[PDB]
Amino acid sequence: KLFKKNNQVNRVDLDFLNLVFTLNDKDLTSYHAEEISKLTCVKNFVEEV
Amino acid sequence: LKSLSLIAAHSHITGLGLDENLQPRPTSEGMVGQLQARRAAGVILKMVQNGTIAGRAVLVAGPPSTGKTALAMGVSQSLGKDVPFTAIAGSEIFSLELSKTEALTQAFRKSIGIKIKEETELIEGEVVEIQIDRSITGGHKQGKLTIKTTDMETIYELGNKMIDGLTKEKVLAGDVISIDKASGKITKLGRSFARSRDYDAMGADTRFVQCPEGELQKRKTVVHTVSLHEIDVINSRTQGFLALFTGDTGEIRSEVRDQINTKVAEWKEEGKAEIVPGVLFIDEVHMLDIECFSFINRALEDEFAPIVMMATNRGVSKTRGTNYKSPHGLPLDLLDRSIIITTKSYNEQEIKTILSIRAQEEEVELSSDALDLLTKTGVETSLRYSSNLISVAQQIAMKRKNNTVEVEDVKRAYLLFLDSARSVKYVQENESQYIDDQGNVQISIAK
Amino acid sequence: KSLSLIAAHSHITGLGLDENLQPRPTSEGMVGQLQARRAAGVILKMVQNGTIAGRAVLVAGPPSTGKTALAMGVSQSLGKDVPFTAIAGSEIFSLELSKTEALTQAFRKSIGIKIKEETELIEGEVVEIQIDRSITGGHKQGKLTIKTTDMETIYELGNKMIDGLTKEKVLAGDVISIDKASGKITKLGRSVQCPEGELQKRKTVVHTVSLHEIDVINSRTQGFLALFTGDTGEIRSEVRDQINTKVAEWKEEGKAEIVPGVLFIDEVHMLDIECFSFINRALEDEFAPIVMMATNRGVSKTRGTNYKSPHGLPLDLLDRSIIITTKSYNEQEIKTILSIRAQEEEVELSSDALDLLTKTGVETSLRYSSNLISVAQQIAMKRKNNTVEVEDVKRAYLLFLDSARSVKYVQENESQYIDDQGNVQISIAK
Amino acid sequence: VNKLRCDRRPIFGKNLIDLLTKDRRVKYDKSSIIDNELIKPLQTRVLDNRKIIDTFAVLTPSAVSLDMRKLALGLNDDSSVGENTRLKVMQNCFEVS
Amino acid sequence: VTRTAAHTHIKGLGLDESGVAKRVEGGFVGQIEAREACGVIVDLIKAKKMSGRAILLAGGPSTGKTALALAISQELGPKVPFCPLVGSELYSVEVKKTETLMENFRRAIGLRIKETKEVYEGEVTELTPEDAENPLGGYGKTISHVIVGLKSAKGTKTLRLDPTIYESIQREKVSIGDVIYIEANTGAVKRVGRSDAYATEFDLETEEYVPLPKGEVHKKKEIVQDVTLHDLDVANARPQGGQDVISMMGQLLKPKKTEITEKLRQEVNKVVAKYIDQGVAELIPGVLFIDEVNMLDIEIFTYLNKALESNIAPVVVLASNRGMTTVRGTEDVISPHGVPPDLIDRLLIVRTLPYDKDEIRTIIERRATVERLQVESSALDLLATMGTETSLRYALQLLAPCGILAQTSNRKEIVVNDVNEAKLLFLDAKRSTKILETSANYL
Amino acid sequence: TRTAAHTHIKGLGLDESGVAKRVEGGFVGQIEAREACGVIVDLIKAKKMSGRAILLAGGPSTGKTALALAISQELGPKVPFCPLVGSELYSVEVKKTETLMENFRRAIGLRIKETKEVYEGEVTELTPEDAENPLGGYGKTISHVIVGLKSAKGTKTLRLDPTIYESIQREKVSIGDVIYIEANTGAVKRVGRSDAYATEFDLETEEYVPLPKGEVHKKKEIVQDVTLHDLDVANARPQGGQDVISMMGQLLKPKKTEITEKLRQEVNKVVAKYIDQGVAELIPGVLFIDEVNMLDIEIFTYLNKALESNIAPVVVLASNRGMTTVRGTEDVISPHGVPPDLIDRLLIVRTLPYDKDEIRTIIERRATVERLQVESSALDLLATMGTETSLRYALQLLAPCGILAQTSNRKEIVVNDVNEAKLLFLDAKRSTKILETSANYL
Ligand SMILES: Nc1ncnc2c1ncn2[C@@H]1O[C@H](COP(=O)(O)OP(=O)(O)O)[C@@H](O)[C@H]1O
Ligand SMILES: Nc1ncnc2c1ncn2[C@@H]1O[C@H](COP(=O)(O)OP(=O)(O)O)[C@@H](O)[C@H]1O
Ligand SMILES: Nc1ncnc2c1ncn2[C@@H]1O[C@H](COP(=O)(O)OP(=O)(O)O)[C@@H](O)[C@H]1O
Ligand SMILES: Nc1ncnc2c1ncn2[C@@H]1O[C@H](COP(=O)(O)OP(=O)(O)O)[C@@H](O)[C@H]1O
Ligand SMILES: [Mg+2]
Ligand SMILES: [Mg+2]
């Protein structure tokens, strides 16, 4: 508990930026990753803005 | 550019300076001089690009700082991407986890690559409406779902087993999914853009992608490049892919390797997979155990042996593991099957070009009189030495704030940092102060 | 407590000293060794001061003369609540752990930290405890009666409190202590004890934890098991680098304090040269214990090298260490030491037997006679007389040989004993 | 949310899941054989040897410490493990035989 | 109060802006040449352009090598990573020495990461599920959205959540009146504890109590935390994720070092190479320091040749004392400083001079001022002569015990009689050898 | 088409019951050597003798290994042959003795042949046949179950015992789906739906296989071969997905464990039981250890007791060295590196160096497999160079001469090309002569 003192203040999740990526082969495929990355919805939020 | 931008020992060397006639240029492609050695390396370059020959070794010989390491490194750059290359050291194959024999077998396995191609038939489209009747009649009432794409929209009938399969990974429609044609596998890509405004805080699974364009079902082929080593590690374990990253192989039995060889043979017979001959380079092989030498002698004759090149600067010396002194530091059996390429020490004219071409890499402007003193000190010292002084003199000149490095700053940089030959003298005169092999040292100055 | 039968050092307790640091002739089981006791006392007050850390001191001397007893008297005089670590030179060599990490682990063990925590506890006899099943009106309703001598009040439980009282079976009439902040119950006995006073009291709880104990917990899911099981297995240095900074912040905040314990190494002459090379760097750091090293041998070969360094230690390590020399005991001190052992072992020795035991102690060794003083009591026990006699000392002298006598016997009997070349004659004739 | 979706989506498998099952699945058929009687895996030998285990198992670990089993795995009433995780593990151990 | 072990009186190199070294600065006396030599090293470390460059400073014992190697680390600052290492520490039972050397090589360099997170936190006022009457055919029973109100000191706000993040709340067993922590990025919910005002409700309570969080409701914050690449590699090797019963025993097992493949390192260099292109991350070099390099085997010396030619190779500084000696692991090879000549060719040589007696007298003075004790000048001269007759580090050791004898004599200042008394109780190496030569058993 | 220092060797190149031919299978000269090995091929094909070892000795580049590859070709692909090096015996996982014993049992293979009658095809219909039960009862009683089978070119109707309804219920087959039925063993197997049913649904997750070709009733035989070691590994290794022991298989690491003698004997018992009934066939193989000089005396000792085993196969050894000190003993001196006690248990086959005229034919025969053609003039230089420098040097210079010929666009090697290739690549003697004239430490 003394080492559980506030962390996420200065802590980075490090799992949100995909530096843990070695866990991505279990449930995820190749072509689904390529098409999933190609189909992104970006530029729609810019229009709605 | 994709690699990290921090400068290395040799960052200037890119490719080899040989033309289509293989005649080397005096200064080209980042290198300088070494004409005959560069041509002898280019013969190996076309020897690899041909790919019709296997199981041969070649040696690069020379004294220290003669360009032997910048030679094999230039071969890997001209060889290009997608051609697998393995550069290790002879001291690295000594491991407590793996035996030297198997650790060397993996060193031979990683070099040769395999390209596998596979075709897929998938149905991907955004869903409009999904109807499934339950209590109206019963028993898989044949519901129908409507899949939408930008340029096409159709309605598909759903079978009983597909009714059972759609329940898992539940779909509310309003969604983009992809169904495998062969296995009927359901995959959920993610929600559309109209669903983004529903919640202020949403889970980590959610996401938004554009509707797929074109035909509903497509035929696409995918290409993969996987080395034989990765195949063997994957087949050796229930989960071997984690064993790749964790680095624990487990000393794969040689029994599985033959099965993998038969698999690759069948894949080549079917034409689905083609192999790319790779290159293996071992640096500083003057220190190696004799068991590794014999295992190299035998393992070089197999059907898949990557081309092996090595560099050793030791003269006639005792081999590690035996009392006798064999020439070159290697047994005569390894020298019997091999080809030796010798490198010669650079002259004064070439050293100044090796210097300026280095200042262009460090982006350090030099005066016309700085290369004179740095070259003069470069002749007595080793070429690998003054290259550090070209780096320090830039900072010493930076303290003086003015532009190019002046000669006086080079003299101060040489004064602050001793040469390897001077330290021997300063040690020999001060010997009583430094510790001795016998352990005797005089700490007190007072006598 | 702490059952112990007899130890070599069992008699000497806490060395001996005066406010002037001048040693008494006989003080607390310590005879002889005037200067050595004064220097060891200076080191002791240096540890108690705690202003200086990471200093090495060497204790040199002949075998069986004033060496280990010194460090024993320093450890006992240092007393409880301060760390003291004693490890043999052969103990740091390990197959599972590297010599460097096993050497750093002692440096981490020799420095402790005190952490204080304040809690509010309610303790007392429970006369009546009522607990009710869930109803629509409320989740659970219960009332426990905690009776103490000064005050008796009733508390209404907090739900999960009721799950703690129903979790472990509690019988009315036993004295328990309930922890509000911790959320657990501690039973101190039955009503064996008596209620002292008011139910709720604010107390502070001090915990003495070494740097090693802090280091192991963070490197593992459960590190406290790795403390006892010795499976620790080379904790990362990055974790320790975080522990040091966190401890620094704890010190600046005032929530913890550090105690500069002592690290004693027996048989340092047998340590490998790599460990000697690591100690030099380990001493110069911020957190390090005061190190005391003792070697019997001198002018010998260092393990791991061909050459012979003086005293058996490298000079680079000798620079960092201060050397203390011990002297061989005189005849008048040996009889007093053997008398102290006589008072320790409940052995009655006559003056006539003390003279012979002293003469044999001077002619051969002290460790020998101090072994004989124990054996003669049984030979005297067969005679049923309570006090040992000269004849029993002579019988114990002829029964159990000395080393010098055994060597002189082996030299004549060498033909019977096995030889370095492996030659032996088991046949009597020819 | 735009940056959230721009981050989350580009998760690339370093190789593939299809490369794992592509280099694994065997082209050869099942070929049901008597080799099933030539294997006799280690798990079945524990069942077939039941008599020898029953007769020749005698000695007992005379000295034990109770509640050292719960504390070894880290699952107990108070620990650093999650509250529901220790329960799910307890049920999984309660099921698997 | 404060602890001082043979150090802490050196606050840096103490160099002027022109690069000239003062006679005495920052606890350092003399050695202008070696100081000016290391300042340019610090400048090269700040330049960030050079990688793999190495500079060796070699001198006699107690010449100030290591003390200077701490001074450069003080000059770099806390932001620049500095990893101390000793040659004897590279040998490990778990993994080969080579993987430990390359491992520390990556432990030297470091990288900073910045990312923005938005969090809703506060006390839960009223939370209600919202169920859709439409069956939709996909599910038998579910919820369309879950509305959870949040109360904070500055203001209150109601939120609309998806059924999954509400299922997490149901896993946390949150009830009305308990403070929760909900992050938007990962979507994780954490219960801090019950609100402080509700504590008076029960006489005895198991749950801890915390005050209501400050802030309106929503908060925007970024985290600039910097992390070394090797820590990304270790975090990459051991996953912390998953609820599987296998993963639990994987957390229970002790961490065991393993040899990391070059492929994983290459992938980490790829993703970092992308993040430095987006500008979200900034890579900074760091310095590796090795003491007693002469203890290294010729194998590690050979691997250092290939390691220094790498692009990610950090700047490493080496320090050695002994003169020309047989290299460890070699039979007949004799090389200066105990380093092979091929490696000496790569490094830069800096030499360290001894100290004059008048400088030693000042060293004892400064060590006494940092020691806070009081020394007479007449005894200071004798301590200087004593230090010059035996060794420099012996007088700095002599300053410690005299303070105790002065307290027993109650004198505030050290007197010549005090140190003269301290000399008899404590002997140096030269006297110990002399008495060691003549005695019965090993003195 | 990849060629590494080999592939021009096809078999031993013998003739029928006679002296070996002059040139056959890429072999030139050394008729006595490949003849003596030719007898060893017959000894191995006899499948009688056990633990009989032979050793071929000779200088380097004398064709020692090509003879072992040749007899490996002569035995055939079905006969197991394990290439092995003396350096591979040292392993950190297990002791050298266990690795040697394992490689000794990797040599002998075992073949299994099985003939099973099958019934495959579509399902025309399924109807029960009601008959009176032996003891009177009100409920239904079925005597037999009728199953129709449709395949390409034929059709058939079958009658089965009523116990088939349990297996059919287990396989869940009803109508219009191709099944798999074994004659005597029985039950069923469902391979997949018939192909004509893919059109009735636009989207379905079940694949449709075509009807079986040929008759609905078939009889086929399948032969499977497995080595005894691969058999033992399966016995020692636990197999399960969810089992607790298998659960400890995951998250931990498998490592080679020393196999007990009891398990090996137990496998020998069942292998003998199946070989007595005629279903199993035991074919001994050949073990090959290159560079036996690299073996420690501890392994040489275990070979003495190991070669006297009953199931021990034929092992061929190669040692190029002359009188040497055996590894592990400094004072002991024995020829070839093999201790005299171990030499006593084997037969030595001498090898002789190749003549000049044989060398030229070696290069000219290597040119065909290399696909490169050379003139007669440039070949005469390759002969003299091959005899002076070394044999493997002229064979190594073939590819660089061809690449230089491609740089000069010529399709055949010329004297200028072999000289230019001589200057670029140096042999051992030239390099060792250069090391002496340089003080640079080169
Ligand atoms: N062709 C070349 N042109 C310019 N510089 C070279 C060339 N070859 C080598 N060098 C120089 O040699 C140095 C490396 O020498 P290296 O090959 O490592 O010698 P060795 O392998 O004998 O240790 C580099 O600093 C590089 O500047
Ligand atoms: N000053 C002393 N007072 C009392 N006993 C002593 C003293 N010095 C040594 N001894 C005795 O010596 C024995 C152990 O000797 P020790 O100090 O261990 O020698 P060393 O440390 O050289 O091995 C103990 O049993 C102790 O009784
Ligand atoms: N120039 C100097 N000024 C002040 N103190 C010094 C100086 N040089 C050395 N010292 C002191 O000497 C002590 C030991 O020197 P150190 O650098 O450890 O020697 P080495 O480099 O041989 O290990 C250090 O505690 C340091 O404070
Ligand atoms: N009869 C032959 N005809 C042609 N080439 C041969 C013949 N015998 C051996 N060789 C050549 O010798 C090489 C193999 O030599 P090897 O036996 O490995 O030498 P060592 O005796 O040192 O093991 C092969 O590349 C092959 O080309
Ligand atoms: Mg090199
Ligand atoms: Mg002792």
Ligand SMILES: [Mg+2]
């Ligand atoms: Mg030091």
Ligand SMILES: [Mg+2]
């Ligand atoms: Mg061979």
